[PDB]
Write a protein that binds this ligand. Structure first.
Ligand SMILES: *[C@@H]1O[C@H](CO)[C@@H](O)[C@H](O)[C@H]1NC(C)=O
Lengths: 48, 48
C-alpha cells in the first residue's frame, strides 16, 4: 500500500505436498492496482 | 411582515432578453490534494 495505491502481486503453481510450505523459487506477477487512498493497519482471511 | 421565503420565475417565451431563462452549469473542482481520478484527454498521433 504505497501513496494511496493498493497493489496485488500473485502466482499459482501445482504441488504434491502433505503439510508444509514448499522449498523453491517463484516470481509474483502484478494482477491489479487499486487507487483506494485508505489507510490500512490490520487484516484477516475469509474461509469456507 | 411574515413572508414565505421562495418565489417562482415567470419564464414566458415573450420575456425580453434578460427576463428569459438561462441554464447554468458550474464545473466546480478542488485541486491537487488527492491522487488524480479525472484528467483531460491525453491526445495521440500515428506510429511511424
Ligand atoms: C491516515 O493516517 C494518518 C496518520 O494516522 C493521518 O495523518 C491521515 O489523516 C489519515 N488519513 C485518513 C484519510 O484517515
Amino acid at each position: 500500500n504505497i501513496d494511496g495505491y493498493f497493489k496485488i502481486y500473485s502466482k499459482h503453481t501445482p504441488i504434491n505436498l502433505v503439510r508444509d510450505l514448499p522449498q523453491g523459487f517463484s516470481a509474483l506477477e502484478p494482477l491489479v492496482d487499486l487507487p483506494i487512498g485508505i489507510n490500512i493497519t490490520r487484516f484477516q482471511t475469509l474461509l469456507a | 411582515n411574515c413572508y414565505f421565503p421562495l418565489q417562482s420565475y415567470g419564464f414566458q417565451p415573450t420575456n425580453g432578453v434578460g427576463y428569459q431563462p438561462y441554464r447554468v452549469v458550474v464545473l466546480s473542482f478542488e485541486l491537487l490534494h488527492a491522487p488524480a481520478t479525472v484528467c483531460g484527454p491525453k491526445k495521440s498521433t500515428n506510429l511511424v
